[PDB]
Amino acid sequence: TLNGGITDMLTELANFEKNVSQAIHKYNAYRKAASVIAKYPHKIKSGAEAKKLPGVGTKIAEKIDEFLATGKLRKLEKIRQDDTSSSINFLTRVSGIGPSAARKFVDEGIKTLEDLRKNEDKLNHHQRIGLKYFGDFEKRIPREEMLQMQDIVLNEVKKVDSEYIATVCGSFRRGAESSGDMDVLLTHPSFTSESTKQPKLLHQVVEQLQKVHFITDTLSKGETKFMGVCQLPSKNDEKEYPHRRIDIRLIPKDQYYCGVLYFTGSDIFNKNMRAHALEKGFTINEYTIRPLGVTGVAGEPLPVDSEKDIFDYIQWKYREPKDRSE
DNA sequence: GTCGG
DNA sequence: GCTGATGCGCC
DNA sequence: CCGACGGCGCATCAGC
Ligand SMILES: Nc1ccn([C@H]2C[C@H](O)[C@@H](COP(=O)(O)OP(=O)(O)OP(=O)(O)O)O2)c(=O)n1
Ligand SMILES: [Cl-]
Ligand SMILES: [Cl-]
Ligand SMILES: [Cl-]
Ligand SMILES: [Mg+2]
Ligand SMILES: [Mg+2]
Ligand SMILES: [Mg+2]
Ligand code: NA
Ligand code: NA
Ligand code: NA
DSSP states (O other): OTTHHHHHHHHHHHHHIIIIIOOHHHHHHHHHHHHHHHHOOSOOOOHHHHHTSTTOOHHHHHHHHHHHHHSSOHHHHHHHHOHHHHHHHHHTTSTTOOHHHHHHHHHTTOOSHHHHHHTGGGSOHHHHHHHHTHHHHTSOEEHHHHHHHHHHHHHHHHHHOTTOEEEEOHHHHTTOSEESSEEEEEEOTTEETTEEOSSOHHHHHHHHHHHTTOEEEEEEEOSSEEEEEEOOOOOTTSOOOOOEEEEEEEOOGGGHHHHHHHHHOOHHHHHHHHHHHHHTTEEEOSSOEEEBOTTSOBOSOOOOSSHHHHHHHTTOOOOOGGGGOO
16 A cells, blocks of 8 residues: 555554553554555655644654665564563463563563463463464454454344344444454443443343353453453354454443544544644543533533534534544 | 643 | 552453 | 643452
8 A cells, every 4th residue: 555664564563662661652652643644645765745734753764764775674573583572562362361461471581472371370361362362363353253243242132122223343344355353232222321221231242142152261351341252153163263353442422423433443533533622622431422611620411413413513514434544 | 642721 | 348559451 | 851632341450
């Protein structure tokens, strides 16, 4: 793609800052620069040209100058040749191992998948699951399979109570031809900002999905969020489907539009949308859009009747989910 | 790492 | 148990 | 050691 060299470089640096340096703001700066550069509709011919974009400063402009001149960056060469860095970065790819645990493990000489397997007693349940399905979770899900999964989920939710409404969000709702995982937004009339009437509204759905063997394991679970694992059933003498990650989020029904905006993403579109909201004097989360009063504190939630209404408050032209991907 | 108070 | 900080994760 | 930077759910740890 156009300017793919540059956005790959900046992404790789981003992941280094997050996973090795533990520098989440440098991670976020590298993410933002890559984002702006990717939507820039010309070939970047210099770092100066790039510097003009919001989120590109001197140091990134200089890196872009090097890469444009040489087709590589020495900094990233050194990082790739550092075995310790590589090991730490690699371990964070296990679901449940973040930058902190990855550094702890590598400090104790645990550097490979083999090592994690030999030292399974050192892992929490989440991590054990991340490891068990490490290969599967590296793979994307074709949209064809996402359709089957949607259909299993909607049907089983329908069977618990026909008043539930389940919406597959994330990259799927953005129309992607493959997805990293399944993200499901769930609402029920009994759960609103004003009132929780039923207990166990999420629980009911999860247990039903476990009962039909769709959901296979649980990473974490509370009253409104479920993180876990699921699997399509497969046909005889045909290899199984990979196990997949699934996220379910129960949102107050009167807050559907804020929730579906959050859960549709992308992640960087969300952060950028929320960033623009702050400079417009608003704050947005998955529940509400609120005005910022001086003293910092946010005021009452503003009424919202559509996804677009949230765009309106901050004066962004509406973006279809298609055009919310990076 | 970048931008803005 | 609490409050608050950290570590994991989600978009 | 200019500080903010998007915002939060679930699990767990420190200091009560
Ligand atoms: N864009 C910047 C740059 C620096 N600082 C901070 C860092 C210091 O804690 C404080 C005062 O730094 P200086 O004395 O360097 O700023 P001066 O304006 O006094 O420098 P000069 O003597 O160049 O005019 O401001 C800031 O708030 N915003
Ligand atoms: Cl940082
Ligand atoms: Cl809403
Ligand atoms: Cl809120
Ligand atoms: Mg997803
Ligand atoms: Mg997800
Ligand atoms: Mg994601
Ligand atoms: Na810039
Ligand atoms: Na991880
Ligand atoms: Na509108």
